[PDB]
Amino acid sequence: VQLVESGGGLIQPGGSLRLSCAVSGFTVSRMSWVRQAPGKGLECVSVIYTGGNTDYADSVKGRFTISRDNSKNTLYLQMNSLRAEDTALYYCVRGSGGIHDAFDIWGQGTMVTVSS
Amino acid sequence: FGEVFNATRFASVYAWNRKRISNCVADYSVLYNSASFSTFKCYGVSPTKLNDLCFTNVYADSFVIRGDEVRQIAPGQTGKIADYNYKLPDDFTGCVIAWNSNNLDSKVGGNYNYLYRLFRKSNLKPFERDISTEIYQAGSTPCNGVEGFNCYFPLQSYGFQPTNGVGYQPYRVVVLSFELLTVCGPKK
Amino acid sequence: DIQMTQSPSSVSASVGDRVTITCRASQGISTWLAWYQQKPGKAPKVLINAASGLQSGVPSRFSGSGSGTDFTLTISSLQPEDFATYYCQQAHSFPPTFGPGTKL
């Protein structure tokens, strides 16, 4: 129902940030990360699967660690290789669903800035 | 019918167990008179007169489905669950029975016991158990590499909590069907 | 990324009229698009089930056929809720890519 997240803020480049989002109203299954540029359109990027299969777009390929905790229902993302393109609004959404790649239950997310 | 109400954990819809009933005295009077059963629809003939009818063999299946899906199981009628999981053949001469088990199957902290089949390439045969965890619900790309998009695990989680409403609440269900080509008996 | 364009790129106030959403194929998309409705300060939500096989769980007011290069959909009438930012997403292959998007 409501996914809750913390750790979205302006940071100097290189800093390690862990993003925590909370699964709500369902048994832990799938989580996806989508980013929207401030005053600009969103862009889908990093996803994880209940099967344990992992898909990362070229924007985060080999650069993002995506995970969830079955015990605490807390989604684990560790920031790595901070880049100008990725930084912006960050949203935790269901990883996949529907007949084809459908995400419906969302949360507030954590907008992220990078600068001096 | 002892196993019919004595299984603590009922079979899930995709993995529906099949049980054989034969060589015994039928008590359909127990079925419609017990008064604890929630649902009782027997399409083949009026349920009360069935006690007289005699058949060569009987087949029965026990599985738990949501209240919303209980209407789906019928001869000539189906639904998403019926199309890919369990469905009824065009001629069924038995009965469909449902009993709600709110306390028994809605435990606190989530229920990992029950899962439901969601995807199949085409309609399954009636009385067919595609229990096999076949994947490959994709087409263009082999499912072996990843569940990237269309590719998915066709089994999905039916987690349960006490707050679940009647449609959400798991309803235990059984189905009965007979054929003669050894099961009956008058008394009094 | 994917190369497609969504129309109407620019939207004037729509009063008592059907609203049409469109996008053009880059991967030979067939029945592979999910429509979206978003309110600022709130989480964006799907405007439809994406109708990969059939449209479902959606008011019939938003209905369209997506196949070939044609991915068009219509809205039955203007509403305060219907006054909402709309977008499109690449569906057939990784990575899914959003279409330009329009707001009212």
Numbering used by the authors:
A (entry chain D): 2 to 117
B (entry chain C): 338 to 518, 523 to 529
C (entry chain J): 1 to 104
Q: What did the article's authors report about this structure?
A:
Overall, a broad spectrum of potent and distinct neutralizing antibodies can be induced in individuals immunized with the SARS-CoV-2 inactivated vaccine BBIBP-CorV, suggesting the application potential of inactivated vaccines and these antibodies for preventing infection by SARS-CoV-2 circulating variants. Notably, the broadly neutralizing antibody 6-2C was less competitive and did not compete with the potent antibodies 10-5B and 13-1C, indicating the recognition of distinct epitopes by the antibodies. Structural alignments showed that 6-2C or 10-5B had nearly identical binding modes to WT, BA.1 and BA.4 spike proteins.
10-5B binds to the residues Y449, L455, F456, N477, V483, A484, G485, F486, N487, C488, Y489, and R493 on the receptor-binding motif (RBM). This epitope belongs to the RBD-2 community (Class 1) and has extensive overlap with the ACE2-binding site on the RBM. It was found that there were ~86 contacts and ~10 hydrogen bonds at the 10-5B/WT-RBD interface. The footprint of 10-5B largely overlapped with the site of ACE2 in the RBM, resulting in competition with ACE2 binding to the RBD via steric hindrance, providing the structural basis for its neutralization of SARS-CoV-2 WT and Omicron BA.1. Consistent with the data from the respective pseudovirus assay, the 6-2C and 10-5B antibodies were capable of neutralizing live SARS-CoV-2 wild type, Beta, Delta, Omicron BA.1 and Omicron BA.2, especially 10-5B, with IC50 values below 150 ng/ml.
